[PDB]
Amino acid sequence: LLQDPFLNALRKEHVPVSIYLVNGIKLQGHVESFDQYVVLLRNTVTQMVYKHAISTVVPARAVNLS
Amino acid sequence: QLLQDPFLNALRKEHVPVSIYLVNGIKLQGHVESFDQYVVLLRNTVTQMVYKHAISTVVPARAVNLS
Amino acid sequence: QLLQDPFLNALRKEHVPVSIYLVNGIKLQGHVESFDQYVVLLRNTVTQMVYKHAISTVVPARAVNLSLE
Amino acid sequence: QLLQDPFLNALRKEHVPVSIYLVNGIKLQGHVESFDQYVVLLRNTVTQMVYKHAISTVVPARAVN
Amino acid sequence: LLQDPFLNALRKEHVPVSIYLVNGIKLQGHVESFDQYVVLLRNTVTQMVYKHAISTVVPAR
Amino acid sequence: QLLQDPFLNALRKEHVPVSIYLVNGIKLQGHVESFDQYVVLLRNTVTQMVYKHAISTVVPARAVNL
């Protein structure tokens, strides 16, 4: 309900994000795409990240909701 | 959900400052802006999406209204 | 939660102190103040909501009051 | 769980000591009091509640086959 | 449609296997049984291994 | 409605090597041979079964777009 709208926002308004994984590392780049389970983070090369492995997504600049 | 939702909503409404402890030991601070079955929107300097499954404990900076 | 509830509820009502171990090795301590399907509210110097999915084991400081059948 | 129940119930009926290893490395020990879809009740000096999702391996002190 | 034929091939051919857990622990033995949730590993005894705690399973040889 | 099937499928056909990062940090490099809903058959010295719920990110050594 919030997950997609959030993710969809970072993508549309193309804004860099610092994805912190459950393991304890911080990925970066832009949100190329996403579905129920995975998120395609397009940086140098689009790497697939599992949502179950994500701890928290952190945006650089704000983004509307509506 | 006769606890989690009421607990979170009261924090959200009253804007009670919370400390969210991640399973990986990381401590996040701020207040609850909103939430659903799967994520919580924490707001501090910015607004970050936190996955519930990665959350350990949520510690309010003060007692919550359950009545 | 066929077994979960009767277990947590007994600890709550009888006000029995417990130690909650998280999947990361952390040891919480206090009283079961409340619970539902996904979370447990532990009380101590403060009050906090603990997610069940982050819990490994709940160890009571002593067996609850047992009766006949 | 067509295996979990038979496996755990065998330990219960035979009163066989077991070692329960948590996903965090810690090992618990004692007897199997009871169990359902989500949890195992392990008895030692006291009866403690163990979530199955936090379990890696269940190891009996002896063969139950 | 993959893990079952994969696991059944290990029990039907009685091939030793290595089960690595998410915590970094390695388990050796033979696949005695497996269902939708657990994997019965056989050595000195038969232990019940939850799939949710299994990261990988590499065949011995 | 699907993102990981095509992502992994193309990485399979194009024979592109990958570096799989498990939730526990460690990394398993090799080629993707097959994959169902729950696991990914990783090829290398041997063919090992990798449970998806243990994967954090799938990082390809080469890119794949169109």
DSSP string, A21-42: ETTS-EEEEEEEEE-SSEEEEE
Number of A:F CB contacts under 8 A?
A: 55
Which amino acid is it at B2?
Answer: L
Determine contact: B53 vs chain C, CB below 8 A. yes
| End-to-end CA, chain C | 21
Q: Report the Cα A51 to chain-centroid distance in Å.
A: 9
Residue E12, SS3 per DSSP? helix
Look up residue A23 and give its two tokens.
């393991």
Q: Are strands A26-34 and B39-43 parallel, antiparallel or unpaired?
A: unpaired
Domain F1-66: give its CATH architecture: Roll (2.30)
C53 CB neighbours in chain B (<8 A) are 53
Other CB atoms within 10 Å distance of the CB of residue B45: 6
CATH code of the domain made up of D1-65: 2.30.30.100
Interface test with B, best of C28, C39, C46, C47 (most B CBs within 10 A): C39
Q: What are phi and psi of D37, to 5 degrees?
A: -65, -30
Determine contact: D63 vs chain E, CB below 8 A. yes
E44 CB neighbours in chain D (<8 A) are 63
DSSP-derived secondary structure letter, A57: E
Determine contact: B67 vs chain C, CB below 8 A. no
Using CA atoms in the order B56, C42, B37, A33, what is the torsion angle rounded to 10 degrees?
Answer: -10
Cα torsion F22, F28, F30, F36: sign: negative
In this complex, the chains that touch C, judged by 3 or more CB pairs closer than 8 A, are B, D
Task: Let me know the angle formed at the C-alpha of F2 by F1 and F4, rounded to the nearest 5 degrees.
Answer: 155
* CA of D28 vs chain C CAs: smallest distance (Å): 10
Look up residue C57 and give its two tokens.
């084991």
Q: Where are the domains of chain E?
A: 1-61
Distance, CA of E38 to CA of F61 (rounded, Å): 34
Determine contact: E22 vs chain D, CB below 8 A. yes
Contacts of D42 (CB under 8 A, 6+ apart): C57, D18, D20, D28, D30, D31, D32, D33, D48, D49, D50
Determine contact: B37 vs chain C, CB below 8 A. no
What are the Cα distances from residue F52, in Å, to A41, E44, F27, F43? 18, 30, 13, 15
Please choose, from the candidates F35, F52, F50, the residue with its C-alpha nearest in 3D space to the C-alpha of residue E2: F35
Q: Is C31 exposed, middle or buried (0-12, 13-18, 19+ CB in 10 A)?
A: middle
Binary contact (B1, C37; C-beta < 8 A): yes
Resolution in A: 2.6
Experimental method: X-ray
Look up residue C36 and give its two tokens.
């539902």
Domain C1-69: give its CATH architecture: Roll (2.30)
The listed CATH number (3.40.50.280, 3.90.105.10, 2.70.98.10, 2.30.30.100) that belongs to domain B1-67: 2.30.30.100
CATH fold group of domain E1-61? SH3 type barrels. (2.30.30)
> Biggest alpha carbon distance in chain E?
30
Q: What is the CA radius of gyration of chain D?
A: 11
Which amino acid is it at D54?
Answer: A
Residue B15: in which H helix or E strand, if any? none
Look up residue B15 and give its two tokens.
């804007």
* CA of E59 vs chain F CAs: smallest distance (Å): 7
Residue A11, SS3 per DSSP? helix
Residue length, chain A?
66
Residue B12, SS3 per DSSP? helix
B26 CB neighbours in chain C (<8 A) are none
